[PDB]
Amino acid sequence: GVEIETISPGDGRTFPKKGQTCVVHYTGMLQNGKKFDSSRDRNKPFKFRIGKQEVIKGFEEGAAQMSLGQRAKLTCTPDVAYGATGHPGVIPPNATLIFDVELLNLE
């Protein structure tokens, strides 16, 4: 259940592929709640690649459905990230997640 809500500007052509290492400014948001995570805090913008299941499934499908310079808004369903489990102390079980994602990558 990946729904993309894009703030317009960017290119719409540089799509990330497998074996490509990308740079994402993410920011976590809880539905009807406070924040829990931000790459803007540490300002080391989380260099990761595509094709190793490093990220969670809802964030992974949100990566390939974006392009260079775009600014989307993810809405991750509980069943793809942590809904049955819950990340201990940080994410409760059955939690729907919101992410502020801008793709300023390379490659």
Side-chain angles (χ1 to χ4, degrees):
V2 174
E3 294 180 354
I4 306 299
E5 293 177 354
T6 303
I7 294 96
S8 65
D11 59 354
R13 65 181 183 271
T14 305
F15 290 162
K17 294 181 181 180
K18 293 181 181 179
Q20 293 181 356
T21 301
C22 58
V23 174
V24 169
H25 294 281
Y26 66 94
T27 296
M29 184 65 74
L30 181 64
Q31 180 182 3
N32 297 114
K34 64 178 291 296
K35 290 174 68 175
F36 63 95
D37 196 0
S38 177
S39 65
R40 302 292 293 163
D41 293 335
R42 293 187 295 271
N43 300 114
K44 185 177 183 292
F46 187 69
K47 294 182 181 180
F48 70 104
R49 66 180 294 164
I50 304 300
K52 299 295 185 291
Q53 294 180 357
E54 296 174 353
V55 299
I56 59 172
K57 291 182 180 179
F59 185 76
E60 183 178 2
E61 294 181 355
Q65 292 176 356
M66 291 176 70
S67 179
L68 177 61
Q70 294 180 355
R71 184 175 179 178
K73 182 178 184 292
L74 292 176
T75 303
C76 292
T77 64
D79 57 357
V80 302
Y82 292 101
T85 300
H87 184 73
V90 180
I91 301 300
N94 193 3
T96 302
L97 282 317
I98 303 300
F99 294 99
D100 194 2
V101 175
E102 182 175 1
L103 181 60
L104 293 174
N105 57 357
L106 297 175
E107 296 176 354

